[PDB]
């Protein structure tokens, strides 16, 4: 995965709501591994993350009409990497 692209895509598009890997809209639905295991539909895995970034969920906007496939893949990988290595 192009983690470099993923990080810049993250800062540019997701940081207002998830700065520090947290969540400013619904505080407990952070991007930490344990939180995603509880709140992310499908659990903590790349497929679940990609699905939500593409399709959206409630106050979480859908990005399929803003970011392209290679950009979505990149950002999903970055989020997974950050969570599993707890790099936030
Ligand atoms: C940017 C493109 C972006 C990413 C990446 C992203 C990811 C993401 C994940 C993986 C979750 C799940 C967290 C969990 O614990 O279940 C999640 C959830 C929400 N998001 Fe998000 N998100 C991105 C962008 C944005 C933006 C710009 C906003 C703010 C307007 C935002 C908000 C939210 C909200 C609210 C949720 C919770 C969804 C729900 O379960 O109801 N995200 N995001």
- Give me the residue spans of the domains in the chain: 1-88
Closest C-alpha among 41, 53, 60, 43 to residue 77: 53
Query: What is the DSSP secondary structure assignment for residue 87, as one 8-state letter?
Result: -
What tokens appear for 29 in the block? Answer: 């639905």
Resolution value, angstrom units: 1.9
Task: Encode 34-47 in three state secondary structure.
Answer: HHHHHHCCCCCCHH
**Span between the terminal Cα atoms of the chain, in Å:** 19
Method by which the model was determined: X-ray
Residue 79 CA to ligand 1 center (angstroms) comes to: 11
> How many angstroms separate the CA atoms of 16 and 22, rounded?
10
**1-88 topology per CATH:** Cytochrome Bc1 Complex; Chain D, domain 2 (1.10.760)
Residue from 26, 29, 54, 78 whose mutation best tests the ligand 1 pocket (most atoms within 8 A of CB): 29
Residue from 17, 33, 65 whose mutation best tests the ligand 1 pocket (most atoms within 8 A of CB): 17
């Amino acid at each position: 995965a192009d983690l470099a692209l993923g990080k810049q895509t993250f800062e540019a598009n997701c940081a207002a709501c998830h700065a520090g890997g947290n969540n400013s809209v619904i505080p407990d639905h952070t991007l930490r591994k344990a939180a995603m295991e509880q709140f992310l539909q499908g659990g903590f895995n790349l497929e679940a993350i990609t699905y939500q970034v593409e399709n959206g969920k409630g106050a979480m906007p859908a990005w399929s009409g803003t970011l392209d496939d290679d950009e979505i893949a990149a950002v999903a990988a970055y989020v997974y990497d950050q969570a599993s290595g707890d790099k936030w």
